[PDB]
Symmetry: D3
Subunit: 242 residues, 6 copies
């Protein structure tokens, strides 16, 4: 028909449906574990690359600090490049400084106790890294060194192994690490999303209502509180030239 | 999903097309934006999967006698051996000699839209194509006899119920001369093709419609070989 | 000859001449109204994409707000992406949030009373949209919510239907809408450019002297006063997930 | 460096490869990242220098009977006349008919790795390839007889000392049937190839190993011509 | 502008070239920048409009005997069947066997510049080209006889008055052996070509000079077919 | 072997080694002076493009000011585009306004007295240009016009003609221009890097220890002090439209 009545809700439905279908395809079509994970990770990266404000980069990377310590391989890193160098780039492979990182996510097919714990360990391998912070020159003078921003951590999946998908067993797993490995938010594309409520100090689950889009908006809103990364002391890295 | 499956690959290829065409239709509540969205999905499928000897894009077609076609939603054409006649940023005008196939892409099949597609196909087939003797590694071939230009219709849905039944067949039999459609796809239901042996249209229901259409197009295009060799000096008569 | 004497004026002449010739070509070469408009719009977009500071994006888009209302299709939107998400992106087609918008232009072949009124209606369809604004975290603390920036509106053409091209009839048309649809500036590539003088509350016309380049500089200088877009409340959009 | 020198150009082509492969091995202290880095260096060399009739990428290969290969580090394949079977962002599945050559890329040659490469090559050679009569400007060629698929091994180093000596030769003679390697490169030491006339493997030491391998590959590929013409309707049997 | 017009399309193609070449000359008051600007306009025209079997770029040319050409402003060459000899970011060295045509691009025609272009063309024509028997779908062709390399001169203006008259003709007749120019374009005035039948140069005034040159180039290139098949092992003699 | 022990020092070695090898290749492979310089310049540009924070652009360009004066051709300009237009762009060739410039470098094959003096003259041709600066609108109000930032100047080479490479003769050459043409830093890829110590008012040479990486870090750290470019008065350029 020729009817035209724009709908904002429909836009958010279509955004989510695209993610859910492509994650489902990645899982069904690729029977090789490496290709299946690469395909699924790429769906989440594309969503963040498309929709996050351009102050954020989203990519697979290793994180390193000025003490020479390295993270594990991080499936989805959200990081700064406006004010931050790469530490190393070789074709498409990148190593980013800890000071550039805003958020880190583990992307896997289905939520489980083992996967939640794995993600907690990945997040901890980043949060343990040392971050420098220098006084910041700007048009109005020099700000004090910015206090270190929280690094957001999370878990991105297509499905849940639990029944109900987002139930007490998922909550138990999330409460397994409330310190260096704490997961601030995550998405189960087929079911809902979760986030840590700092005021109540508990995890909240939200069912349905366009899970990937709801996760994306939660991430944008929480990232706003972080502002920009602190200003890196590249000369701390330079101690390793000799 | 225990093991690799060709059937699953072809299902996923098709499901991506069907879902994105449905998104284009639902999300863009503006006629121009909706058509642009849907056309781009079909063009992307062809760009991704057709052999690289084929280009696929929106274009006008023109011949060396100054006859211009209507704007064509989906033109499949050669660029390995053919120039553009004109390009201005994204807008292109191709010579008739470069064309392999022409498709109209719309939301839902109907008698009016089948007729519209038939007229668009005829408008390109009625253009004059030159053909020169072809130099090659072994010498010079005689001028290639002109290749048929394939035509068709690509939609998401059908206005008819049943979707791919007698009313659709009647519409397709409305032009059996130079607007005859060779093949088409209704992403939500199936695909169709002209059966030259039986001189009738055939419908195939389900069974991964976009992928089935894609394969039919590749197989039929192979019979055309490469485009005939253009006489660019015929176009050059318009320089004076 | 081998003489070399750099000229800044010549650079600005060549910038303008390129625009004027390509707009003329778009009009003469494409006898299909859709292709002709697409070709001309693309010339103006390319100029802004090439020369505007990179804090600005320039593209064709629809604008939407957190109340679910949509603008008309806008030929040339100047908007932020450094701090603003897309609301929806499908291949190259984009829907931007009202909070991201700096300026909106209608691009057509020739100025007339009807086209000026059409442009006024397009601009109004954007300015009527609701824009959120949150307190802004930054390295020095938190700014108050930024007061909403003006959205600049205008009209970009190749020719003028009036004789003289930029005369009292054009002025009359511009004075038709001094509120939601007011056109702050515009360019008639073959003749000159116009702008609203806020202090005198009248429209000023400038004839010749490299019209497209003069328009570009006027736009850059006026955009500087807007600073960056206010900070979007993405959770206002999130009310439409349920 | 008084004047232009072909030898210097070929030395610089090789030195770039050797240094970047060494960087990949040293810098990336993670097995997945290290392999990705090294594979990308070899793919970039082929992408840069092979004739554009050849594509080079990581891919799975599948045939029209549903047989799938293992993941292949470096596939050299046609896209001018061949579709993808499936593409999802960077991941691709190509039809067996499109394949010209397959290589395994690893850090250092060893008996286990030579055997691994032989098995990978056999896995692709054992796939079924269709071949149809080929329309062209002069008519229709008979179906092209199937082209050999070239196979090999690409490494930075050798675990053996001497690097390219009798132990390497013994490993290469471990598969003289459908896993036989045609050529390979050890960037730090030399290259090897199967000599069909003498029915033995030959090693060439130094003398710009990556460039020498590149040239051997180009020359050998020329004998294959273009891939046979795929029967996409054989794959279409999996639509139902 | 009531209706579509081929003449208008060809006028707009030419006017874009003429205006951009004039901008390059006026705006860039530095000899290196001015030449880079103008050369890029001509390369862009060829990149946009020539059939994709042709590449167009600035390059050096080298042969398998180690003879190097001067730097060539505009080389038209094959990459479908030909490797690069060397590539380092934007700088390329192509094998003589890949070359279809060579042009010098400058601001204004003059006796010195016509002679300069003749010498540049001769420098490429004097390089040795290999040619091997060519495998193809039907078998193996004999080695292709060597194709002529087309040469010419591309400028914005002419220093002579009249621009394209007897003095220009005299300069063109200064080299009728291996520096002979086949065609060229003076964007502000017309184009020229060697008439093999009459063994004389012909000038065409106005009538969309860049477009006329483009069409002449396409038509003449078609007679060359594809480049002969390179013997990369001839270059490989320089590995040792 | 299967050992995995990440090393930050190795990353910095590999970054430098890539630069040193590619500069050596440019010098050896291209026997045409224009191609050789284009090849070498491109190596340095790629390093800065890859690793500098994205607030910086790096390219070959001419610089112009609002008085109509032009610099010489600058091999490597580091400049802003987030807040600054191009003055002219024609295919890949660019002319940037003086207000956009952060740093300028001359890139050549081997350091010598003549090359140091040439670089000093190039840097002076940029520093002599006039830069405007306007009060800066931002989310917190309007900053005063930013005082003009120093433009960093330098010299980038593969080799040194002197023996020792970085000795008293190099120091003498650097002390030849301590004003408009002063070179703040530079790199001799095969030997080390140098920088001007403002506190001691002397040049310091650092030998080995990954020269290109050490230069890159020195540049990043010094650029941080400059903050962002002052805000351009595009209407000063607009005086040349008439
Ligand atoms: Cl018709
Ligand atoms: Cl097997
Ligand atoms: Cl010569």
């Amino acid at each position: 028909s020729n009817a035209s009545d724009w709908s904002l809700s429909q836009l958010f439905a279509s955004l989510h449906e695209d993610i859910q279908l492509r994650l489902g395809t990645a899982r069904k079509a690729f029977q090789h574990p490496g290709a299946k994970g690469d395909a699924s990770e790429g769906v989440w990266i594309e969503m963040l690359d498309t929709y996050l404000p351009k102050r954020y980069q989203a990519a697979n990377a290793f994180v390193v600090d000025s003490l020479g310590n390295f993270s594990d391989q991080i499936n989805v890193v959200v990081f700064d490049r406006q004010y931050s160098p790469f530490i190393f780039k070789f074709n498409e492979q990148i190593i980013v400084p800890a000071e550039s990182v805003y958020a880190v996510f583990e992307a896997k097919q289905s939520a489980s106790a083992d996967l939640v714990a794995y993600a907690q360990r990945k997040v901890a391998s980043v949060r343990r890294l040392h971050r420098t912070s220098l006084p910041i020159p700007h048009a109005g003078g020099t700000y004090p060194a910015k206090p270190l921003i929280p690094i957001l951590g999370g878990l991105l999946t297509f499905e849940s192994d639990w029944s109900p998908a987002l139930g007490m067993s998922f909550d138990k797993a999330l409460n397994g690490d409330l310190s260096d490995g704490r997961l601030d938010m995550g998405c189960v594309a087929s079911h809902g999303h979760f986030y840590f409520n700092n005021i109540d100090s508990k995890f909240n689950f939200e069912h349905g209502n366009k899970p990937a889009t709801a996760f994306l908006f939660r991430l944008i809103a929480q990232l706003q509180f972080s502002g920009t990364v602190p200003m890196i002391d590249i000369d701390a890295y330079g101690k390793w030239l000799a």
